[PDB]
Design a protein around this ligand. Structure first.
Ligand SMILES: *[C@@H]1O[C@H](CO)[C@@H](O[C@@H]2O[C@H](CO)[C@@H](O[C@H]3O[C@H](CO)[C@@H](O)[C@H](O[C@H]4O[C@H](CO)[C@@H](O)[C@H](O)[C@@H]4O)[C@@H]3O)[C@H](O)[C@H]2NC(C)=O)[C@H](O)[C@H]1NC(C)=O
Ligand SMILES: *[C@@H]1O[C@H](CO)[C@@H](O[C@@H]2O[C@H](CO)[C@@H](O[C@H]3O[C@H](CO)[C@@H](O)[C@H](O[C@H]4O[C@H](CO)[C@@H](O)[C@H](O)[C@@H]4O)[C@@H]3O)[C@H](O)[C@H]2NC(C)=O)[C@H](O)[C@H]1NC(C)=O
Ligand SMILES: *[C@@H]1O[C@H](CO)[C@@H](O[C@@H]2O[C@H](CO)[C@@H](O[C@H]3O[C@H](CO)[C@@H](O)[C@H](O[C@H]4O[C@H](CO)[C@@H](O)[C@H](O)[C@@H]4O)[C@@H]3O)[C@H](O)[C@H]2NC(C)=O)[C@H](O)[C@H]1NC(C)=O
Ligand SMILES: *[C@@H]1O[C@H](CO)[C@@H](O[C@@H]2O[C@H](CO)[C@@H](O[C@H]3O[C@H](CO)[C@@H](O)[C@H](O)[C@@H]3O)[C@H](O)[C@H]2NC(C)=O)[C@H](O)[C@H]1NC(C)=O
Ligand SMILES: *[C@@H]1O[C@H](CO)[C@@H](O[C@@H]2O[C@H](CO)[C@@H](O[C@H]3O[C@H](CO)[C@@H](O)[C@H](O)[C@@H]3O)[C@H](O)[C@H]2NC(C)=O)[C@H](O)[C@H]1NC(C)=O
Ligand SMILES: *[C@@H]1O[C@H](CO)[C@@H](O[C@@H]2O[C@H](CO)[C@@H](O[C@H]3O[C@H](CO)[C@@H](O)[C@H](O)[C@@H]3O)[C@H](O)[C@H]2NC(C)=O)[C@H](O)[C@H]1NC(C)=O
Ligand SMILES: *[C@@H]1O[C@H](CO)[C@@H](O[C@@H]2O[C@H](CO)[C@@H](O)[C@H](O)[C@H]2NC(C)=O)[C@H](O)[C@H]1NC(C)=O
Ligand SMILES: *[C@@H]1O[C@H](CO)[C@@H](O[C@@H]2O[C@H](CO)[C@@H](O)[C@H](O)[C@H]2NC(C)=O)[C@H](O)[C@H]1NC(C)=O
Ligand SMILES: *[C@@H]1O[C@H](CO)[C@@H](O[C@@H]2O[C@H](CO)[C@@H](O)[C@H](O)[C@H]2NC(C)=O)[C@H](O)[C@H]1NC(C)=O
Ligand SMILES: *[C@@H]1O[C@H](CO)[C@@H](O[C@@H]2O[C@H](CO)[C@@H](O)[C@H](O)[C@H]2NC(C)=O)[C@H](O)[C@H]1NC(C)=O
Ligand SMILES: *[C@@H]1O[C@H](CO)[C@@H](O[C@@H]2O[C@H](CO)[C@@H](O)[C@H](O)[C@H]2NC(C)=O)[C@H](O)[C@H]1NC(C)=O
Ligand SMILES: *[C@@H]1O[C@H](CO)[C@@H](O[C@@H]2O[C@H](CO)[C@@H](O)[C@H](O)[C@H]2NC(C)=O)[C@H](O)[C@H]1NC(C)=O
Ligand SMILES: CC(=O)N[C@@H]1[C@@H](O)[C@H](O)[C@@H](CO)O[C@H]1O
Ligand SMILES: CC(=O)N[C@@H]1[C@@H](O)[C@H](O)[C@@H](CO)O[C@H]1O
Ligand SMILES: CC(=O)N[C@@H]1[C@@H](O)[C@H](O)[C@@H](CO)O[C@H]1O
Ligand SMILES: *[C@@H]1O[C@H](CO)[C@@H](O)[C@H](O)[C@H]1NC(C)=O
Ligand SMILES: *[C@@H]1O[C@H](CO)[C@@H](O)[C@H](O)[C@H]1NC(C)=O
Ligand SMILES: *[C@@H]1O[C@H](CO)[C@@H](O)[C@H](O)[C@H]1NC(C)=O
Ligand SMILES: *[C@@H]1O[C@H](CO)[C@@H](O)[C@H](O)[C@H]1NC(C)=O
Ligand SMILES: *[C@@H]1O[C@H](CO)[C@@H](O)[C@H](O)[C@H]1NC(C)=O
Ligand SMILES: *[C@@H]1O[C@H](CO)[C@@H](O)[C@H](O)[C@H]1NC(C)=O
Lengths: 348, 348, 348
């Protein structure tokens, strides 16, 4: 017998004061369209120009927000002439061979001088080519290492603008429920008179007059409130000898000695009769349970970042460049010939 | 005495026509799950393959959406032989030294020819190594400067899909309120009979019959509307000699000469009595104010992009590459020897 | 004459059991603020350090969630001496010219040896410079090709956190409607007594007692339910000889032979009178239609990715680097002079 038969002091209106309410409801929302450049980047031109490559995403967000003795002296004469004539013929061999040698040395040394001027013109091409191609690799890699940091901050400002768009759609879906509240609260109280307590102004409803506002409706409700009220002890129902008895359109207001079915909204007692009450059987309480679970969503739970990275990420490190190490590739006779050019006159 | 005692013409139902309403409410939403590849990238394979590195974000969005004389001639003979014998010994010095010199020149010139063929084989290695390593730097930097632009557009299409997911969750949270409206509107009008005006069909409620639809409930409401109605002047309350008097379950319908408490929803006058009215004291109006602020959120206001960039951004520019500038490193005797090889025969 | 005059079996409460409901409503939501590092990246330090360059986006999401014979022998003596004296003067020419030649060869060969040591010191500079500058291009391009893949996965986890923030704002905008339901359901049933069926506990309302919970209100409603009920055939209205007749605060309960206006919520018949019914004219049904379109949004439809890419995307491919191809730039007299240095003694 838990609560259905407990008696507790309940305020019941003793008397009334006449009153009026001004109740304001928003029924529409002005279309807060957003320029996506000025929101995310603002004045800053390098990120602005990057925004064009994010596509027409801005428009897409605005679809949402815009909706919603003479012999031996002579034989010595033969001898010395035969020694000389044979010597000079050996001088011509000695000298012709030296000319044929020194003329092959002067050939090959000038062919080497040609080869080194060929090498310098080709290597001037290589250090000039590498100058231009490697300056471009440096100049463009500096651009790409800048842009990847500005894209980072654009992408975190995208989420700030997506929180803006979500909170601006959330509010517009509350506004469209407040326009349904303005529909029922117009109907039941401008076309009718409500029997509900505090719907259509504080207290109990008499009459109403709607007036517009720029995005709203405002109600003038004329109502009566309890100027004074008294706590009577009560029960919702009473179980006499195993039968439960309970009101019809009232409560059991409790006098010191008797039960009366007062109207809930006023102290005006009337006697228990089979026309003021309903009746039951066996004196039992049915117990009901209601649990209004507003929806608790499947929230997007994720692995640790290491697992969702390592699934596809490649930690490729290019090797330390090594190339060819070219540091590993490592007068006396003219004095005499000048001396004997003089000292041969000592044998003239 | 603002509005509680003003009298204005109010329509009160003179007569009724019987009527029926068909009222359609959606109570459920079919689960519009989204393939995230086909939404963002579609057929285009380069961005598709990029989508795998954005992780299982697609699934995460689908958790949401799937929920929700013889002596001097002889001394001259001694003389000339002594001059010749001494000259030939000086020829052997002159010639042996020239051989030892020209043999050091032919050594060093071929050691130079060896050094230059060593240099060309090592430099062929360097321009071959730099050919491969610098072609890879070019070929991969072209890939990374392409991918960073395709990632840009994927990331702006992510926001278009996040606006899709937000507007699809927003609608499902309206659907779950329309399923609460279908619960109260089933209960009060299929199990009951409502006293509210225009809830459960236009006019005043008699009876109802629910029927299903694929994701909805449809109500047949049987109701009566005012076929005809008349404007009576009225007041919600009247203050006689400083006491306010007001109805009990009606309005003061105003006849040319008398006040009657008509039932709000019908013209049927009854006389003012202490059983048709309540009474007050001192003739004052209580004024109440209600302002239904649907929530205006803390929207995500940000610095200018320059401040949120400059906090972490580094404007590092790599220097213009300069390297070594190798352009800054800058027969008559054989004719005679051929001539005297001939002209020495003139002294044979 | 579609449904307003059809008769069908309707359950009308025959008798009552007293009952109580416990009804739980959440009225507030605890502020589930999110650390954005730990959500997206977790422990993993390389992506954590990247999060700082996405800006204060985390805060921005938390603004949302924290809200919400002697002569001829002598003439031969003159002859041979004149041949010798003339020969030696031609030896001095032959030898002085060879010295002046071999001294220009030893000059130019050592000037070549100087030029090649100049070249090796300058090229050691170039392969040392390119070693450092090209190692940095390799080492930094490896960093940028890593970061662009970790940013990809951060940006797909951003959407998972934006689905988290959207579903956490969606639920908080249901909570604020359940706090409006707790306001009307407190007012009409703790301050009043509702005439609605199943609002404020199963069945019909007597009385209520609210109790708090940590983020909620719980109502004890005391109510009566139909212990027993009987199906009477009924009609909402009847059209006698072309006039429609319908109840006042009841239904036409159908007895085997007569119509009675029973109270909708109880079987207690009363006779048709002009005080139990309203009356009409011409016997016609008005048909109304209501279609509660919960808002179907302008969803963000996009081009195929190829069109939104090709609008701005540049498919720039850098050319295959070609540079200078340096592979296209391509003793007997000393034996004799050693032999005649010996064999000239055969003419001494
Ligand atoms: C009305 O519906 C509400 C849901 O819409 C219910 O709220 C739920 O209440 C339960 C129990 O209090 C709660 O379960 C978890 O609560 C803790 C918060 O996560 C969690 O730590 C608990 O886990 C502990 O207890 C279990 C069970 O013994 C153990 O197995 C665990 O090892 C651990 O010790 C528990 O799992 C729900 O989270 C909560 N949901 C919501 C949405 O609030 C109301 O209880 C319900 N009221 C009535 C009267 O039915
Ligand atoms: C019911 O509640 C509503 C809020 O839920 C109130 O709406 C608010 O109304 C005020 C005043 O009209 C408004 O304040 C600002 O309005 C302008 C829009 O931003 C703004 O420019 C104003 O600033 C100007 O005025 C102030 C004050 O003199 C000066 O200091 C400024 O320098 C400037 O000149 C003002 O700050 C709110 O924005 C608005 N809020 C919303 C959510 O609409 C209703 O007024 C209220 N109604 C009643 C009858 O109480
Ligand atoms: C209450 O309002 C609802 C909207 O709030 C209405 O629902 C709408 O119903 C219509 C018709 O059933 C539907 O139109 C399209 O339905 C199909 C789904 O996209 C689509 O394939 C259809 O296209 C076909 O038919 C047209 C017309 O013949 C042809 O031109 C086409 O070539 C094709 O063959 C059709 O365009 C709406 O989508 C739907 N909207 C929603 C939000 O559900 C209810 O019908 C309405 N009820 C009453 C009783 O008025
Ligand atoms: C991808 O390659 C990265 C190198 O390019 C690598 O980073 C390296 O990680 C190891 C192990 O964590 C570190 O080794 C040392 O780490 C700390 C730092 O002092 C020491 O206390 C430890 O004792 C250990 O010796 C390297 O220092 C670190 N190198 C760099 C440049 O960061 C990543 O771990 C690799 N990731 C994957 C998934 O393979
Ligand atoms: C980061 O470094 C950028 C250079 O790589 C630098 O851009 C340079 O900005 C200056 C000042 O705005 C510009 O200087 C000239 O700008 C206009 C352009 O004609 C002139 O009218 C001015 O009188 C001025 O002389 C440079 O032209 C510009 N260079 C480039 C290549 O864009 C950024 O400003 C630097 N940013 C930060 C935050 O340090
Ligand atoms: C941007 O440049 C890309 C090259 O860097 C280019 O990719 C190339 O596309 C063509 C045409 O689709 C492919 O050609 C062959 O494609 C398949 C592959 O076997 C064959 O069956 C076909 O018959 C055809 O011969 C190239 O293979 C492909 N190259 C690479 C490296 O992917 C893009 O198409 C260019 N995009 C734009 C928009 O210009
Ligand atoms: C009976 O009604 C009176 C008011 O008419 C209640 O008095 C209030 O009680 C609360 C709770 O102790 C106090 O905080 C207020 O200051 C009291 N106001 C006055 C004017 O006395 C009283 O609590 C009610 N009795 C019961 C049992 O609810
Ligand atoms: C060898 O001696 C002769 C003398 O017989 C030199 O001939 C003279 O050379 C000088 C120049 O050095 C001239 O001015 C004279 O006119 C030359 N004299 C005659 C007679 O012709 C010859 O120069 C000497 N050679 C060497 C290498 O000492
Ligand atoms: C009394 O009721 C009549 C309708 O029965 C109202 O007449 C309408 O008044 C509006 C406002 O001027 C006009 O736009 C309509 O065309 C009128 N309809 C007809 C049929 O006349 C009249 O306004 C009501 N009087 C008051 C004071 O509200
Ligand atoms: C010097 O004169 C002699 C003659 O005494 C030349 O010897 C002749 O050389 C030719 C070839 O040029 C041969 O055909 C003859 O058979 C040789 N004659 C004899 C007798 O041997 C010699 O060639 C001359 N040298 C120069 C350099 O003119
Ligand atoms: C009259 O009321 C009774 C219950 O008092 C209804 O009986 C139920 O009918 C449904 C539909 O066939 C069955 O699934 C249940 O098993 C029945 N319950 C019992 C206890 O019999 C009956 O359907 C009602 N008649 C009409 C026309 O609605
Ligand atoms: C040419 O013959 C002379 C002899 O008249 C050689 O002179 C001798 O040389 C040897 C060394 O080879 C010395 O040991 C002797 O003392 C030298 N003798 C004299 C008398 O001085 C000369 O060496 C020979 N030259 C060649 C090239 O065979
Ligand atoms: C074979 C050769 O020439 N080796 C030289 C060595 O003699 C010299 O001392 C050194 C100094 O750099 O360079 C190398
Ligand atoms: C020392 C030397 O050889 N300098 C030369 C110069 O004589 C020549 O005129 C110039 C032409 O390129 O090249 C350099
Ligand atoms: C003009 C010249 O020297 N050309 C040479 C050729 O004789 C040699 O056969 C070839 C071998 O690599 O190299 C080149
Ligand atoms: C209800 O109140 C009366 C007096 O007002 C008292 O006699 C009675 O015992 C109360 N009910 C219960 C169950 O105590
Ligand atoms: C309450 O109403 C009665 C009924 O007229 C009246 O007699 C009494 O004086 C009123 N109370 C006050 C405090 O005015
Ligand atoms: C109310 O209407 C009556 C006539 O219908 C009029 O005499 C009376 O003055 C009106 N009330 C006011 C406050 O003017
Ligand atoms: C309105 O109802 C009354 C009551 O029967 C009737 O006499 C009158 O003719 C009705 N008015 C019209 C226009 O039918
Ligand atoms: C309504 O029910 C009665 C008997 O309960 C029957 O005579 C009458 O024909 C029914 N109405 C219609 C339109 O059939
Ligand atoms: C229903 O109520 C009546 C009225 O007192 C009673 O006579 C009848 O026995 C009750 N039915 C049951 C099954 O108790």
């Amino acid at each position: 017998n838990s609560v259905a038969y407990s008696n507790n002091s309940i305020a019941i209106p003793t008397n009334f004061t006449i009153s009026v309410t001004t109740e304001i409801l928003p029924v529409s929302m002005t279309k807060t369209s957003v320029d996506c450049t000025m929101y995310i980047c603002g004045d800053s031109t390098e990120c602005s120009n990057l925004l064009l490559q994010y596509g027409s995403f801005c428009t897409q967000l605005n679809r949402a927000l815009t909706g919603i003795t003479q012999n031996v002296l002579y034989e010595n004469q033969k001898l010395i002439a035969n020694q000389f004539n044979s010597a000079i013929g050996k001088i011509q061999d000695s000298l012709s061979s030296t000319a044929s040698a020194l003329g092959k040395l002067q050939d090959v040394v000038n062919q080497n001088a040609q080869a080194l001027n060929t090498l310098v013109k080709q290597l001037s091409s290589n250090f000039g080519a590498i100058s231009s191609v490697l300056n471009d690799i440096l100049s463009r890699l500096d651009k790409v290492e800048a842009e990847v940091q500005i894209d980072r901050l654009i992408t975190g400002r995208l989420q700030s603008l997506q929180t803006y768009v979500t909170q601006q759609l959330i509010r517009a879906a509350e506004i469209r429920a407040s326009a349904n509240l303005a529909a029922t609260k117009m109907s039941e109280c401008v076309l009718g008179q409500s029997k509900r307590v505090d719907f259509c102004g504080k207290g109990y409803h008499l009459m109403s007059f709607p007036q517009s506002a720029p995005h709203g409706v405002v109600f003038l409700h004329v109502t009566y409130v309890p100027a004074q009220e008294k706590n009577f002890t009560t029960a919702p129902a009473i179980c006499h000898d195993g039968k439960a008895h309970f009101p019809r359109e009232g409560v059991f207001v409790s006098n010191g000695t008797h039960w009366f079915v007062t109207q809930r909204n006023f102290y005006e007692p009337q006697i228990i009769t089979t026309d003021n009450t309903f009746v039951s059987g066996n004196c039992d309480v049915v117990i009901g349970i209601v649990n209004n679970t507003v929806y608790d969503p499947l929230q997007p739970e994720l692995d640790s970042f290491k697992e969702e990275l390592d699934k596809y990420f490649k930690n490729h490190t290019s090797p330390d460049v090594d190339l060819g190490d070219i540091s590993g590739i490592n007068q006396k006779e003219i004095d005499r010939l000048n001396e004997v050019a003089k000292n041969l006159n000592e044998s003239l």
